[PDB]
Amino acid sequence: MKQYLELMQKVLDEGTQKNDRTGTGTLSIFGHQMRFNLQDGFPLVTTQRCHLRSIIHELLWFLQGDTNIAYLHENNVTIWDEWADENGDLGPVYGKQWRAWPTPDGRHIDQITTVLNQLKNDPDSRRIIVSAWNVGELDKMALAPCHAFFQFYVADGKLSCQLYQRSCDVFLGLPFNIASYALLVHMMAQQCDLEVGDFVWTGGDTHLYSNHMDQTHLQLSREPRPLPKLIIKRKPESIFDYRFEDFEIEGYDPHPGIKAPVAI
Amino acid sequence: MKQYLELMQKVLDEGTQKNDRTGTGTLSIFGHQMRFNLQDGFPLVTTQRCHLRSIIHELLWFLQGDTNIAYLHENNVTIWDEWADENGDLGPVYGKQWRAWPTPDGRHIDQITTVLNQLKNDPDSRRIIVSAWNVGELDKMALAPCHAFFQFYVADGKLSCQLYQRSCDVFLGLPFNIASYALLVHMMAQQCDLEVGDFVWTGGDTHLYSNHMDQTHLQLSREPRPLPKLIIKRKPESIFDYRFEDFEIEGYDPHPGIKAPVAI
Ligand SMILES: Cc1nc2ccc3ccc(CNc4ccc5c(c4)CN([C@@H](CCC(=O)O)C(=O)O)C5=O)cc3c2c(=O)[nH]1
Ligand SMILES: Cc1nc2ccc3ccc(CNc4ccc5c(c4)CN([C@@H](CCC(=O)O)C(=O)O)C5=O)cc3c2c(=O)[nH]1
Ligand SMILES: *[C@H]1C([N+](=O)[O-])C(=O)NC(=O)N1[C@H]1C[C@H](O)[C@@H](COP(=O)(O)O)O1
Ligand SMILES: *[C@H]1[C@@H]([N+](=O)[O-])C(=O)NC(=O)N1[C@H]1C[C@H](O)[C@@H](COP(=O)(O)O)O1
């Protein structure tokens, strides 16, 4: 995509050389924003094929409040195997915080339901947020949330969402996070009889791993193509009832994929 | 300041009327980003007078872990008055989450000292965060955190910071929040022997109240002036040991103030 490729070139031209956790080294920049008007089409990168099944399954997985890769397996999604433990468990990550943020007094708060109700009953609210950044349980998480905080906004029957990503594997992860939250907005908009609006993406440590230079240059030389369109062929009775078949996407004529190693 | 003034112009050009809870009506936009190179100067608005006195005191107050107006009062700062209960208690707001976010297993986390230990031993970390958005105790707070989430970054011996403000009263609160965090960056940096880099501001519902238009236009019709300079005259043994007096602001020649009624 236009913005996606500009953000990539930017890391190359401005990124600072940093030594990271994995000891691989990256080119980093701090703070950056991208806006995506959903009216123009789904933000699924075209300069590289991306499987919507991957994206669509992990998201449904979160909305389920599940933190065990079992399900993700029964559908060939593996990006979460490396971190899950012996029993395929990752701890109180994303799903757990979205669906059951544990209170100190021993209760649970369902941010999604709350958010659903706020959208339906009080769209002007400026407290329509949901964050996975639970300081009290980070140590228990197999890994700290990258996309850790997002907020919904409504104006003229349009539903927007701004995502704050503290850490961002520009080449590997970004394309997926974008599509995922873009897909969630659509779902929320459907269950709330709203029209989709803007998807604002904000990042903290935005980086490009040193051993991704080649794949990047390659991708940087490809011409982007019109964005596809997302079709949801059925409206479940809730936001926790969508399924893989429900979504469809036309107009996706991407360039072939580009293989790259993941940094552990 | 240019950034602040351009922001105000932006909300006026691309804003959209919205009805807030105080039923006052705002003109808002969603998502925005501005950077301030603390090296260029201290970001205290000049197109309108501000009192560093108050800013400092509220900040020292946060760093204390105090959520009771008594302190603020013993110092003539009264902005929080409106929201304090009969005992000057605001609930587990800012200061409390910073110094003692309560975990579910009876623990309490001091996000401030943590960040200080990280800026010292693992500055390359991508998870140097402080969150005030504690979903668990949100119902006990007098107000839901506006400046609710921030992140630090280090590069070339310079400390940077990015703040996510879910809600922003562009005319009233913004000026103070900016100067405040900028003030925190200089302090952190001093404790860690770093140099000040950039302060990046990112916002959610960035609005202007209806009763603030004539004033925002008056201010908007003013020429900015050179940013003042911040001078610390003592390096305390800890970030929690600063006193009002250690701070010295230089060359601040602002225009006259401008009164506008706060929205309850
Ligand atoms: C260093 C690093 N670490 C991570 C750790 C955990 C992650 C969890 C999720 C995501 C992003 N979301 C998805 C969601 C689905 C898939 C993958 C990623 C990528 N992927 C195939 C590639 C599919 C494609 O190219 O379409 C793979 O095995 O990489 C998936 O099935 C990224 C990371 C990163 C990441 O991007 N970088
Ligand atoms: C609608 C709305 N509500 C708020 C509620 C609580 C706030 C708490 C802090 C701040 C921002 N930080 C400071 C820090 C110091 C001062 C004030 C604000 C503004 N202020 C006025 C005096 C306000 C008063 O003391 O009554 C001044 O110009 O000195 C202060 O002393 C803003 C709000 C808002 C805000 O900006 N807007
Ligand atoms: C982390 C991530 N996740 O774990 O769920 C995701 O969805 N997208 C990412 O971009 N992402 C990446 C960023 C970074 O390179 C690493 C983790 O490193 P650290 O925790 O920030 O030190 O994963
Ligand atoms: C809230 C504030 N604070 O609580 O400390 C601050 O620092 N500055 C602000 O700009 N801010 C404003 C934004 C908005 O107009 C209200 C909060 O309203 P809700 O979003 O309904 O809670 O105060």
Return the closest-CA partner of residue B45 out of B260, B258, B202. Answer: B258
Q: How far apart are CA B188 and CA B130, in angstroms?
A: 13
Q: Which residues in chain B are closer than 8 Å to A19, comparing Cβ atoms?
A: 124
B103 chain-A contacts, CB cut-off 8 A: 104, 135-137
Q: Are B169 and B151 within 8 A, CB to CB?
A: no
CB B252 within 8 A of CB B227: no
Report how far residue A211's alpha carbon sits from residue A255's, in angstroms, rounded to the nearest whole number: 21
Q: Which of B45, B33, B253, B64 is nearest to A29 (CA)?
A: B33
A11, A19, A30, A207, best to mutate vs chain B, most B CBs in 10 Å: A30
Query: In testing the pocket of ligand 4, which one of B26, B164, B169, B205 has its CB within 8 Å of the most ligand atoms?
Result: B169
Rounded distance from Cα B173 to ligand 2 centre (Å): 6
Resolution, expressed in angstroms to one decimal: 3.0
The token duo for A233 is: 């062929």
- The pair of structure tokens assigned to B202 is 């990112």
- Of A158, A79, A83, A97, nearest in space to A133 by CA: A97
All domains in chain B, ordered by first residue: 2-264 (3.30.572.10)
CB B32 within 8 A of CB B215: no
- Could you tell me the two tokens for B205? 């519902």
Q: What is the distance between the alpha carbons of residues A49 and A59, in angstroms, rounded to a whole number? A: 19
Token output for B13: 């050009």
Please give all residues whose beta carbon lies within 6 A of any atom in ligand 3, as ranges.
A 21, 143-144, 146-147, 167-169, 173, 177; B 126-127
- Integer angstrom CA distances of residue A116 from A159, A188, A217: 12, 7, 42
Spatial separation of the C-alpha atoms in residues B170 and A51, rounded to whole Å: 42
CA angle, B18 as apex, B16 and B24 as ends, to 5°?
125
Give the catalytic positions of A in this structure: 146
Is residue A90 packed enough to be buried (19+ CB in 10 Å), middle (13-18) or exposed (0-12)?
buried
Instruction: Please report, as a single letter, which amino acid is at residue B260.
Output: A
Q: Which two tokens stand for residue A12?
A: 């190359």
Cβ-contact A187, A242 below 8 angstroms = yes
CA distance A225 to A199: 19
Reduced to 3 states (helix: H, G, I; strand: E, B; else coil), residue A144 is: coil
Q: Which residue of A has its CA nearest to B166?
A: A126
Give which of B93, B129, B181, B18 is closest to A149, Cα–Cα.
Answer: B129
The bridge status of strand B158-169 relative to strand B101-102 is unpaired
Quote the distance between the C-alpha of residue B213 and its chain's center.
23
- Asked if B239 contacts B116 with a C-beta cutoff of 8 angstroms, the reply is yes
What is chain A's length? 264
Quick one: which of A199, A228, A184 has its CA closest to A56? A184
**Which among B35, B149, B153 is the nearest to A205, CB-wise?**
B153
Tokens for A234, please give them: 């059925």
